[PDB]
Each structure stands twice: as C-alpha cells, then as structure tokens.
Design a protein around this nucleic acid. Structure first.
Lengths: 210, 60, 167, 165, 129
RNA sequence: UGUGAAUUAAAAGUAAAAAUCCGAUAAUAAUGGAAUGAUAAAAGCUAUUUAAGGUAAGAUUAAUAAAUUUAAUCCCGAGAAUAGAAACUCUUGAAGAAGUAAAUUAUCUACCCGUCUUGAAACACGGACCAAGGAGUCUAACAUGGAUGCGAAUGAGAAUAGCAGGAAAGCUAUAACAUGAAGAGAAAACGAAAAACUAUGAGAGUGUAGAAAUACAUUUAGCAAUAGUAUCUUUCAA
RNA sequence: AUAAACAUACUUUGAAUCGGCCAAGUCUGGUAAGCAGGACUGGCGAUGCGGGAUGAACCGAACGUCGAGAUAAAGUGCCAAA
RNA sequence: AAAAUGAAGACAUUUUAACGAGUAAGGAAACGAAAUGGCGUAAGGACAACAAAAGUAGUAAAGAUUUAAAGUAAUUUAGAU
C-alpha cells in the first residue's frame, strides 16, 4: 500500500544532500579563488549575478501602454508582487524601461528559501494552490525532474536547465508593505529613492516585506 | 458656433482593444491575376493527374 | 487592485440540453455520466453536440449516410440530429443512430434491412464508441448565410433582402 | 493642412541620393526574382512610369508572381483596426533584394552541414556531432582572474573645472 | 444546539431624501440621478445595499429562537413539519379564527411542534379571570 | 625640558571574553500579549535498539598553517522497529444575561434634489404641502435569434362544407393557393456530375512505460469548416 | 528571451456616441490670456477614498461587508493621530 | 472557471482558486448542474384537510394605525387597536 511513501521520503533526502552539495561546493570554489588571487597579487572578477527578483512598487493607474505590456510579460500585475527573472541582455533592458514602477536586485539563498517556503504557490489546473506537500510538487513538475520543494529552491537559485518551466509554474508572490525608501518612491534608489536596481540591498527590503 | 475640427486623441487606444486583425493564411494563397502561362501549365497538369486518378478509380 | 487583460465572464459553451424536453435532458444526464466516468473522447463529443441549438444541429439525409458508409459496411452511423429521406436515390442497408428519424426515412432504412437506433440503444451497445462513424450535416447551406454582409462589397457581396421594388 | 495629391510631400522622399543620379546599376535588371523571395519596395523617382505609391517605400514584401516585365510583390497594409493584403506589380527598377533572412540562412547551412556528417558518422558507427547551440541574449560573464604582472592602474577622480573661454 | 447568527448591518437602508420629504417614502430606491450625492458614494453618504451585506447561508432566514418559519392554516398543515420539529416552527396565519387556533395549538403540543403565535387572538381572560 | 601623529624591539598572545564606536545584519529562539479560531489523535514530541550522517563548526590529539588542509578515536546520532501520556476551573443572568429598537447627549462625519452641460451646492431652470391619475401601446410587412412540430416538403383556423351539444369554444374535411424543392438573362431563347480531386482537421483501436492519474509509438477513419481546384447551367460578361 | 487554454479565431444581431475638457522637461497664430488650434500619452467626463486648509483634472491609490497588521503620498509646537 | 456527485436532499448541490468601482447602454421567459436571480398590482385557468364534507372567514374578511421579526434590497410575516 503506502510503502512508497518511505521510498518517496528517502529519495527527497538523497536529492537534498545532492542539492546542498552543489550550492556549498560552488560557494567554496569562489572563496579559494579569492584567497589564491590575493596570495599571487592577481585580480579576481566575481561572476555576474544570474537571478533577479523584482517587486512592483507603483499601482495600476496612469501607466504608459508600452510599460503596461512589459509589466504583464513579467507577471508584475499588482502592487507588492515579487517574481524571479533570468538575467540577460534581453531582460535587463526591459527592467530599465519599467524602472519607475519596479525595484529589483540580486537575492541571496535565504531570501529564495523564505519566499518559497512562506509565500510560495503553484498554478495547477488554473488554480493558485499554495505549496502544502511534495506530492503536489511531484505532480506539478514531475516531468521537469523537480519532486521536492528543496529541488524547487535549488533550481531557482542556481538557474538550472528547467528554470523557465519551473519559474512559470510558480505564481508571483504577494508581499506585505514595508518602508520603501528614504525620501520617497518618486526617485531612483541611487538618489535615496525607492525604485531601480538595489543590487544586494533588495534582501533588506524583502526581509521586512516577506 | 465654431467647433473643434479633428483629433487623433484616443484613436490608438480604441484601435488596440480588439487589436489589429491579421489576415488568415488563405489571404496569401490567392492566385487571381497570376502569370497566364504559369496558370496554363498548372491547369494542364491538374487535369492530367485528375483524369488518371479517376480512370484508376473506375478500374477498381 | 490588479491589472488584468479582461474580467471573468460566462464561458460561451452550453453544458446542458436546451429547453424543457424531458427526454433530451435524460440523454444529457446519461452521457454526462458516461463522459465523466469512462473518460472517453467519444462520449465527450456526443455530450457536446447534444447541447447545441437546433440551428447548429443540421440534418443529414439518407444519401449522405449511404455515401459516407459505403466503405464502412459493418459500422453504425452516429449523427446527433434529424435524419431526413432523399427520395431521389436508393437507401442501402445500414444501422443508423440519430435523435430523430423522419417517417419516410425510417421506413426506407427498415425496408432495406437496416436498423434505426436511438441514442440510448447505442449507449447500451457501443457506449465508448467502437463501431461508430461520427457524422454531422452541413451548416453553410442555410439560406440566411446568403444575406449576411454588405451587398455593395467588391469581393463577396451579400444577397440583398428583397422588398419594395426589388428588380 | 496638405493637399491630397498622389505624390504629396516628396521633396526629400523622392530625391535621388547625393551623387547618385542618372542611370541605375545593371544588376537591378539582371537580378533573378523567384516566387517566395523577400524584396524591398524602393520607389525610383528617376523612372516615373509605374512608380509605386509612396506609402510602400521601405516596406519589405514577398514575391508572389513573376511577369515578363514586372515582379509581383505582396506586402501588408494597416487599416482602421485591421491589416489587409496588398498585391502589387512592380518593375525591377523599384524593388531590391531583401537581406532580412541573411542571418537565418547562415544557421540553416551550418545545421545542414552538421546533419550531412551525422549520416556519415552513424553509417560508420562513430558517435554523431551535435547541432550548433541556439542563440541567446548576452549572458552574465563568468568569473575571471586577471594576472598581476601586466596590469597598470589609472586613478579616477572628479576633474577640476576649467573655463572654456 | 444553535449556531451564532451574525448580521453584518442591523440598521435599515432608508431611501435618500426620505427624511426631508413626506412624499418620498422610506422604501429603498437606488438613486439614478446624474448628480446624486449618494450614488457617487460621497463621504458621509455612501450607504447602499450590496450583496456583501448578505448574512451567512447557514444562518439565513433563521428566527432568533433558532428555527425557521412554517405558516399553518389548519391541523393538517402541522403534519408536514412533524418530522422536522427541531428545524421548523408553526406560525398560524393572521386570518385564522380563535376557534381554529385552539385546535392547532392543542395538536401542535401533541406533535411537539413550537408555535410562535401561542398567545394570539386569546380570549378576554386577562382581567377578572 | 615636556607632549607627541607614525614607526621600531622585547614580554604576552592559537589570536572566539565583556563594553562602546564603526561595519554587518534582521531573523532561529525565549518571555509577555492582540485579532480570528480548534480540542482530538498525531508524518506530534519522549524513552529503548542498529547506524546514513556531523563538508570551517560536535570534541580532542597528531603532521603543519595567513587552511571551509589530511588523518586517528571518541561522542551525538536522522530512517526504521519497539513502548509513551490531554480531558479543566471561576464569575454573572426571569431581582432581566447577550443582543436589538426608540429618545437624548458626546467625538467624528454630512452643501439641493431632477435635468441640459467640458463642468452645478450654484447668483442656471422646475419644485409651498398631501392624496389619487400619469407617459414605449396596438395593428400590419420584413429580418435575426432562443424553445416547438413536421421535413422535399410545411401550412391549408383561404374562403367554405359538415359533426356531436344547445357551443363566437373543440373536431373533421386528398384542397385553390402561399413559401420551398433550380438557376441565370433586359428579352427571345435556355436550364446543372469527371456517381468529383487536394490540404488540414473530429472519432476508434493496439503496444510499452511511469506507475495513481497520465504520457510516448503504431494502424485506421476521414464528418463540420476554410481555402484551392477539374467539370456543368445561364449571361456580352461569373 | 519573455508571456499566453476561462488562450486563440471569431460569427450574427443590436444599443449608446461622434458639443468634449485638463496636464505636460511639446508645437503653431497671437503682446498675452482660465485665448484659438494640433502630435504622443495619461486622466476628468463615467470616480469615490488618503494628502495638498478649501478645488473635475495635481500626488498616492481606483471601491463586495468586516477584524487585525505592516505601508503610500505626505506629515510629527496646538487645532491634529504622530 | 474547473473537478466531484446527482431523481429530489436543499440553501439554486460539494470542494478549490481567482475575481467584485462606474454615466450612456446591454443582459425577455424557459433550459439539474440551469445562456443573471428576484419583489410587487390586478384579472383568467387550475392546485390548496387525500378515509365521503378537502384553503381562510360573524370564535371576525378586506382596509386603516402602530409594535416586533425575516430578507443585502425590492418587500414579506405576525401581535395589538
């Protein structure tokens, strides 16, 4: 009967060990290279970020038609909505176009974990169901070799082969309110404002928003 | 009683509600007004293939 | 609020037999159960066609049944509509399942040696559909379709509703 | 407020290229157009007979019919809220071969060359080569290490303002 | 056993301007005026009926005693709610005489059905009796 | 002669205490609450077994070291198997509880309705007050559409003629005709098959697999619809 | 690359409407105008809510009935919560 | 909207998810998983104590004035005079 549940349980454990090995091993290699570059007097250029998290800051009223279309193609259809975005020349230009309406940056692993674990959900049969078990994730993304929520987190964070199929299943997160800016959300974050690229400082804003 | 003459205001918004209706595939496949000799060549082959097909259908 | 493309309106598909006919309502229940349980595309097709309106359920004559069934000798035509009789041409032997058979059409099928089933007998014999040939009648042969459009058009003119002094 | 003439507002549109007057090339009338080709309509004001309408200038179309002196071209036109199919007949003096698919035709040949070797490799039993990778937007650059022996440093600071007068 | 009946708005939705004119009754009518204060939901006057005020489906049409209403005109009407005496309650119609009301009240006690007009049209047995 | 930014020697120091500043962060936790709930067993938690594991960091020692370096033996130990436990208090109410209504007070809140208008609370018009009456109806022709009957037919409540019953109702009338089955031409004069073709498409099986649903491969079928065709009737012209 | 199955393609029948007004890192006539007329977009009209004391258009944000919490524009001597 | 169930329960079925501003204007009736749901006025044809005396009514009708209850509302219900 339900002897497969233990078989399912162990398999999730085995993948979790594999997933954490990949993230830890890749992180270790960066430190070793930085350590050796300093010894040899070289210069080390860190790799550009691959994952971007964008949040919709401004409402739905008074938006240009071209800006309106882009925010729909990024699934930022509501204020205080977060999505993950693959970083390339195509998407970076799009985010610049809608800069006054979004704030984005590069998330850490703990940010990705807390977003998926607390505010995560999937689109199953047209229904936005929150994540409640790995059996609901195995059904949703079985053919994409994602069977557990940890596998979901690892594929998002490392931007794997099936990011697009995995990302499109995740519904855009719904976040709470938080202090957006120092001055106001009418200027860029560089000017002390609210919108624009926050680089690694988006994690602090997401901490108060999750 | 002078009136405003003309405005394009709200005309692009109206045009994109039920947006630009593209033509179907059958619109690009019309052959009216093609080459006269090319039409003669195509018709000659179609009549040759059809007659052969119907002759075979008659045998069986 | 939320910026959607459109708001949810009722989907324009019928999911029940139109009208108060008690027997057609029973057929919808019979095939709604079969489509749901057997999960067969055939019962889904019959259930979908049973809910079309009268104008969307055009007739099929014995002449078209004869031709479509020529290379299907041991088969059962399944047409969700009335079956009329084409008096111009002979009626071969065939088993036909249809909503209604015209008095002249049923006698022509019966005399030739065929069988005029209804849609409950077919569900009893071939519920999932095994020796069936799905058949539907033509829709564009209606006289209304001639007059649709602008008759002044250069490509496909309409047909000019007649009236005062229609030369 | 303009007039509704056929060739209105063409002081600059219909002007010839600077030092590009007179007769055209000989390649224009010697180029062979086949059905399904991509062409560009470019009105040549030097030839006033059969000049295409000024709204089609610069549009890219498809050859749909080849006539003894004219080349049929099929472009798309935009109307109130729809798009219509326009079928024109243009002499080769007003059209030009289009390079819209030039890059695509390069990938088609690269794949076909690879697929031609695979039937050879599969015939001889050797493992077969993979097709070229798909195009991607400029990806994030990976981690790179810069040697410390061939490096010079330039200090950057805001510049003291100097009068241009 | 009886659930908690929650009413979202216990007041009355009175017609606009009904408090100023006697010709305008208090039965509600949606204002269709192009300049109407209420229909534009001005601050201070933005109280209109909506589907959002509807009470819970479970506790809808339920009397405060915890039962529903079932009007009766004779003794045979009671027999329709004798299997559901924990769900319904007899309510003698307003035109039923006093002689017939005793028969209904006497029988409803036999069938253990509550009557909500138990002291209706009673005789003058209030003083000197 | 004194202070002294900075630098230098020796002692101490394995370079994690505490406090403040500066950077870095915010979340795991503990203790008090608040809003809406629930009350019963747990994929709870705890105890006993073996042992995947502990990637700077569970401990110690060794070799050495600007190490998230390499070993050794100790500890703890996830899975799994075996045994474990939750049924409560006090106050108020037929001397009127909880709720609800009316009146008054207090804080907050509230411009005249209908209408034409880009825009009215408007110094724009109608309106003193109440009751009753008060405005998309009927006839005729056409079309679309939803339900209905019959179907190359449909109607024949066309007039009209009969029946029982006494009947402005009901029933019966091999029937003139209306619409349709054939279309084009101004008219004379005519009047439709190569028993069709091509493309995509609805349905039905069989096998394998994941394994729960469901997905892949193969055989067959070709309706509706759209487009394109060969052929045929009429017209100067399809 | 991204998004898209209550997707997409529509078909038929029909209503109302074509007096418009405003803003601007825009333009033309004019000395200028809360003047006259245009290009692109967003609004008001058809729209309430929080802020600008008050205001059709400005700023935030668009509304089923509610409870609790972080927030937006913008504020924190009293009116006035800080 | 999608799944599940379905001759009759009942609240116009059960579960899950998204959604809910609005002038002019549209959404006729019927349609079991119902192609919007309902309230009110009058008149016509039936139904209304199933055992042969079969809806209410001089043991007090309709109307009127009020007191309370049900419904988001249109309105309905009952008490007293």
């Amino acid at each position: 009967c339900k002897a497969r549940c233990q078989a399912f349980r162990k398999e999730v454990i085995l993948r979790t060990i594999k997933n954490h090995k990949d993230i830890e091993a890749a992180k270790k290699a960066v430190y070793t290279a930085k350590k050796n570059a300093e010894i040899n007097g070289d210069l080390y250029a860190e790799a550009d970020p691959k994952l971007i998290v964008a949040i919709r800051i401004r409402g739905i009223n008074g938006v240009s038609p071209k800006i309106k279309k882009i925010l729909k193609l990024l699934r930022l259809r509501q204020i205080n909505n977060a999505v993950f975005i693959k970083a390339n020349a195509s998407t970076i230009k799009m985010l610049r176009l809608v800069d006054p309406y979004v704030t984005y940056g590069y998330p850490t692993l703990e940010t990705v974990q807390k977003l998926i674990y607390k505010r995560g959900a999937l689109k199953i049969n047209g229904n936005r169901m929150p994540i409640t078990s790995n059996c609901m994730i195995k059904k949703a993304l079985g053919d994409k070799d994602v069977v557990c929520v940890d596998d979901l987190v690892h594929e998002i964070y490392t931007v794997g082969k099936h990011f697009k199929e995995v990302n499109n299943k995740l519904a855009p997160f719904k976040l709470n309110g938080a202090k957006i800016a120092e001055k106001n959300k009418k200027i860029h974050f560089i000017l002390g404002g609210g919108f624009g690229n926050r680089e690694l400082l988006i994690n602090k804003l997401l901490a108060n928003m999750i | 009683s002078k009136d405003k003459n003309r405005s394009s205001h709200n005309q692009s918004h109206k045009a994109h509600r039920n947006g630009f209706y593209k033509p179907k595939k059958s619109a690009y496949m019309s052959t009216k007004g093609m080459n006269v000799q090319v039409l003669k060549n195509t018709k000659a082959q179609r009549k040759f293939a059809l007659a052969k097909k119907l002759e075979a259908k008659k045998a069986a | 609020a939320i910026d959607l493309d459109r708001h949810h309106v009722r989907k324009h598909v019928s999911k029940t037999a139109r009208g108060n006919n008690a027997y057609m309502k029973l057929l919808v229940r019979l095939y709604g159960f079969l489509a749901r349980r057997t999960q067969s595309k055939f019962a889904k097709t019959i259930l979908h066609r049973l809910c079309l309106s009268r104008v969307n359920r055009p007739i099929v004559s014995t002449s078209k049944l004869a031709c479509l069934m020529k290379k299907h000798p041991e088969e059962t035509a399944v047409c969700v509509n009335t079956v009329t009789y084409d008096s111009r041409y002979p009626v071969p032997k065939m088993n036909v399942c249809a909503l209604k058979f015209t008095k002249t059409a049923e006698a022509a099928i019966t005399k030739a040696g065929g069988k005029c089933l209804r849609f409950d007998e077919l569900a009893l014999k071939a519920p999932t559909g095994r020796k069936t040939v799905l058949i539907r009648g033509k829709r564009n042969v209606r006289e209304a379709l001639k007059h649709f459009g602008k008759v002044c058009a250069k490509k496909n003119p309409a047909k000019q509703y007649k009236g005062k002094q229609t030369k | 407020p303009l007039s509704n003439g056929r060739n209105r507002r063409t002081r600059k549109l219909f002007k010839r290229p600077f030092r590009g007057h007179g007769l055209s090339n000989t390649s224009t009338i010697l180029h062979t157009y086949k059905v399904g080709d991509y062409v560009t309509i470019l009105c040549n004001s030097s030839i006033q007979h059969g000049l295409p309408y000024k709204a089609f200038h610069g549009k890219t179309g498809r050859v749909w019919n080849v006539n003894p002196h004219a080349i049929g071209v099929m472009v798309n036109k935009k109307v109130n809220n729809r798009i219509v199919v326009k079928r024109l007949h243009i002499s080769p003096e007003h059209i030009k071969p289009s390079g819209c698919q030039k890059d695509f035709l390069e990938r088609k040949a690269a794949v076909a060359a690879i697929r031609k070797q695979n039937i050879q490799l599969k015939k001889e039993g050797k493992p077969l080569l993979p097709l070229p990778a798909k195009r991607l937007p400029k990806q994030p650059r990976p981690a790179e290490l810069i040697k410390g022996a061939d490096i010079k440093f330039t200090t950057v600071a805001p510049l003291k303002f100097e009068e241009l007068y | 056993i009886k659930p908690k009946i929650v009413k979202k708005y216990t007041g009355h939705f009175k017609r606009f301007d009904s408090n100023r004119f006697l010709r305008v009754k208090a039965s509600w009518r949606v204002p269709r005026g192009i300049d109407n204060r209420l229909r534009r939901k001005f601050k201070g006057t933005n109280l209109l009926p909506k589907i959002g005020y509807g009470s819970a489906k479970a506790t809808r049409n339920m009397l405060p005693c915890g039962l529903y209403k079932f009007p009766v005109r004779n003794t045979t009407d009671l027999e329709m709610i004798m299997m559901q005496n924990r769900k319904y309650a007899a309510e003698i119609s307003h035109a039923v005489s006093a002689k017939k009301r005793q028969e209904i009240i006497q029988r409803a006690k036999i069938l253990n059905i509550r009557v909500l007009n138990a002291d209706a049209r009673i005789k003058k047995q209030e003083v000197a009796q």
